[PDB]
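Dear colleague,

Following up on Tuesday's group meeting, I ran the structure prediction for the twelve-component complex that the binding team flagged. I've pasted the input sequences exactly as they went in, so you can double-check that nothing got truncated or mislabelled along the way. The structure tokens for the whole assembly follow below. Feel free to forward this to whoever is handling the docking comparison.

Inputs:
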Amino acid sequence: GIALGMIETRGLVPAIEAADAMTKAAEVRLIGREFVGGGYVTVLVRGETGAVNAAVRAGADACERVGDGLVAAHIIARPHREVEPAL
Amino acid sequence: GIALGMIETRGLVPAIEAADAMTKAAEVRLIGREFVGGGYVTVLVRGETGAVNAAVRAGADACERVGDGLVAAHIIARPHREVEPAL
Amino acid sequence: GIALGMIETRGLVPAIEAADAMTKAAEVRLIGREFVGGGYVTVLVRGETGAVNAAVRAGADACERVGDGLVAAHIIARPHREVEPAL
Amino acid sequence: GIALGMIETRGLVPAIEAADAMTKAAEVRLIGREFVGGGYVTVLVRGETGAVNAAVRAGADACERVGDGLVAAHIIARPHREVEPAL
Amino acid sequence: MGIALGMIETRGLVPAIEAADAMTKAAEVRLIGREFVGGGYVTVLVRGETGAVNAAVRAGADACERVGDGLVAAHIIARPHREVEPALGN
Amino acid sequence: GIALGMIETRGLVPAIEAADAMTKAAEVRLIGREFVGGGYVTVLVRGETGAVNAAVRAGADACERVGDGLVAAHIIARPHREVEPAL
Amino acid sequence: GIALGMIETRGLVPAIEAADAMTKAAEVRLIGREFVGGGYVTVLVRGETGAVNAAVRAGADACERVGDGLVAAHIIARPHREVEPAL
Amino acid sequence: GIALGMIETRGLVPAIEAADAMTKAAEVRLIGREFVGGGYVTVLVRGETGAVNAAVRAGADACERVGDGLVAAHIIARPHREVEPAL
Amino acid sequence: GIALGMIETRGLVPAIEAADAMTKAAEVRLIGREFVGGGYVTVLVRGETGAVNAAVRAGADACERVGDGLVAAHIIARPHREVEPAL
Amino acid sequence: GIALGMIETRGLVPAIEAADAMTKAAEVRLIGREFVGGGYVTVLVRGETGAVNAAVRAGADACERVGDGLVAAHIIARPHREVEPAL
Amino acid sequence: GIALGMIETRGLVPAIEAADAMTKAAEVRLIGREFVGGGYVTVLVRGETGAVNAAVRAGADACERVGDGLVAAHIIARPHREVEPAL
Amino acid sequence: VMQSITTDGLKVSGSLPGRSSLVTGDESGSGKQLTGDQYLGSEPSPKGKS
């Protein structure tokens, strides 16, 4: 796939929670795990657009109040060829 | 050509979505993705002055409400050559 | 010039545009951009103390509105050699 | 995917901006640009069902405020082999 | 060398021609094409960098809004996708 | 003469009589007779600016009682060379 | 003969009726029939001025009742040499 | 041809914009520019009577509201022999 | 870039500081600094349309209160191929 | 001849109407074209008393309404020799 | 000494007294003595940023009571290499 | 000739590649807070995110 699912939160706990939710809920291959600073942690996964949407929504739903919570999530279907160097 | 465009938020998720908006909005090449620290994240693009304007304007002003939000955006038509090490 | 001028802010966007003010205001050469931590960013420039003062004030005056604003604008006209290994 | 998305609009300008939305929204490939006659222009893309659905949503949402407006917009997810000679 | 797309629509070819004339008098944009949509609709297409495209498209618009039937749609593509022009006719 | 005069009308009766008025009123040379489509007919003549204007005035007043009448009358003096490949 | 007779109508059936009036009203050669676009159809014939006038009057009196019928009907006595390249 | 058009304004900016109007509106040959003094700048262009008139007309229309304004816009069609060495 | 930016003032000091704003704003090369007379002073720049726009606009934002201040900042987007001797 | 005709005005537009009025009114030869400065522009002709009188009358009666207006138009009958080498 | 100080004065007397103040006050070199026209005279000195600051402070405090006084006194510390053609 | 007003209120003109209601495409973001530096006139721009 080419679509990029992606979630980010406070602390690594909800990060791996969203990751486990995505890898269980969609045809998605986890490809990036970023420690951002100040507790911001981002998990970014690659898969088809429908799978990306399903995984993102499932992770966000199962990750709502646990830990310190999400801050956002998004469904990108195609980053440009020049965006993948950022990951 | 050498116009330098800037996007700055807390958490790299609005940053990279502004970056996708950059590479989808105007002919600007992103040349850096920097982790400021404490959760602050920055994307650093290059392109034509009007292109930088269109890109940065659209992306930053569209991704303000994405999660915890963008903090600031800025544009430089010509950085000084001596400011090269920052690149 | 050997005197030091230097700027501190939150997020490097005000830092780099204040460095642009440095290098458009007076004949000063920047030596470094440093991520202090927790969003704190500093810029370090050489110059003669007249140019140092002019540039540093220009950056401070052009820097407060950008992002989170300044944290400290400081100049030293006689930097010791013994300080250089920290630079 | 072989899902076929396709958009009809008032003349060529909304068609081109809709194709822009196609290629910036989700993974689709422009298979056709057709000038029906009498001011009608249609764009034909292929891809995965969910991706094409998101893409055509974005294309419409772009086209309503462009020019004279949208005419018609449909999502065929299973183009029969008998339809292939028509495309 | 500008690849941003400046392209507009007119009812009738008279506004198309005079709007394209203003287009190429108002910026350095290469007139890449004219297309007859059908029923008198004419779309003109030029390539150039974003600022030139913006200025020239604006000028063509406020020149063509009155000529003949008038403008139909004036739009500015800044990032034509790699696949669009082959479907656009290159 | 390099000035380009040109007009629009409904059908060929007004177009041909307008071309005749072009030729009789002023000694200009016709360069194009274009079928825009949907009954839209345009004529494109070449001559010096005064002759262009006079001929176009004569053709313009000679078509309202002819068929459906004139739709778009226009004179320009200096077209850019970029329009020539479209001519 | 160089005199031009030429008629506009809606749909080519009244155009064929007008050409029929041409061919049994006077001995005048037809130069062509053409589909203008949008349903407009133009018939153009050449002949002597009196024969052209009589034929055109006959066609106007004949084809104006069929469907929408005649749209524009007028003659040119001695067309200019610059006009005929359009034919 | 021989017709002389010429535009007077105060400040060089309206002068060059009037000259651009001359050489973009009609086919004329600009023969020169003159710095009169006291802020007075004039552009002298050459061409046929119709082109010169149309050019100066368009230039006056454009140059009314630019900068601090136009002074006098005039047309000469038959410059005398001893008048030319003034140019 | 060939777009010409133009800006006028009264006195050499505002003109030269406007030229500073030119060289510090965007990629604009000053091709001529000429003296109209009567206090009127001219500065030109050449570059891309967007860059020229940003530069001239910044120059205006810089020259407003420099002694006499701004007089005219009107600009163009393309000089004609003939105006070079007039440049 | 020997008589000296002279006319001066604010701006060179009315100066050139003065000059060509000189030439058209009668046969008189021009001897001087003067840019005095501050907007004053002057023209000097040489001819017979009646011819120069008629010429200057025509110029003063023609160019006042043109532009900002005439300011002085004198005529001398017996030009002294001592003024000649000053010219 | 790259910093460029410049003073605009009503006439040559305030200009040269200002230049003398420049040369007596701080270490500068006089590079420019320009006559704008209409009485405006501009003086251009180069030197160290603080040196130029003190010098032109002295000159501005010099020129208020001399004749008609100042018009525009300004300081720029960074003349670009491309500005040299204007210097 | 098109007109505009500078960020400090000054008067500028030219081709001026700004925002106009006749042309679509440049709607996103132009309306909201102005970014650092400056390119767009103090004249307010149409919205219609679209």
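The CA atoms of residues 43 and 50 of chain J lie 18 Å apart.

Cheers,
M.
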